[PDB]
Amino acid sequence: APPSIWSRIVNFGSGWGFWVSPSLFITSTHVIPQGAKEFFGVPIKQIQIYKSGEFCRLRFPKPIRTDVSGMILEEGAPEGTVATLLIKRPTGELMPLAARMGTHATMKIQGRTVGGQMGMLLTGSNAKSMDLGTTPGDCGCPYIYKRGNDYVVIGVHTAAARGGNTVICATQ
Structure with a gap:
């Protein structure tokens, strides 16, 4: 696959996640570390967290990965x-x-x-x-x-x- 894709795959807790957009990140619920205060600098309570099954989807209040175009x-x-x-x-x-x-x-x-x-x-x-x-x-x-x-x-x-x-x- 393209490199523009692979650079979206960063580590996250005990596995990985993926920058869909500058603001939007997906991962597995089972990899999220227990009771962190912060994700990528931003405090937990300012992140919109959506969960369905083991699917997890963070939307950040400001852009984080300004380098990626939204998928x-x-x-x-x-x-x-x-x-x-x-x-x-x-x-x-x-x-x-x-x-x-x-x-x-x-x-x-x-x-x-x-x-x-x-x-x-x-x-x-x-x-x-x-x-x-x-x-x-x-x-x-x-x-x-x-x-x-x-x-x-x-x-x-x-x-x-x-x-x-x-x-x-x-x-x-």
């Missing part, structure tokens, strides 16, 4: 869409993982109940290795697809099955 964010992709999960790792590896997007669904995973738009990685037979598939620290990395000339953000990675291939894109 399209949608409530998931059409069923069957091949999307990319844009994984960053701590040592700066960029790992675009192709995923066929399924329907909204609920699973028990990593000892808990999750929902969102389900997907399968198109990365191998059994993407259990972090060479081929996700790792717990990838939570909050974004799912994007190209619709003609626009890039569309559909949400963030929040969980993966033990099988390696099945994954949840938290949405809305």
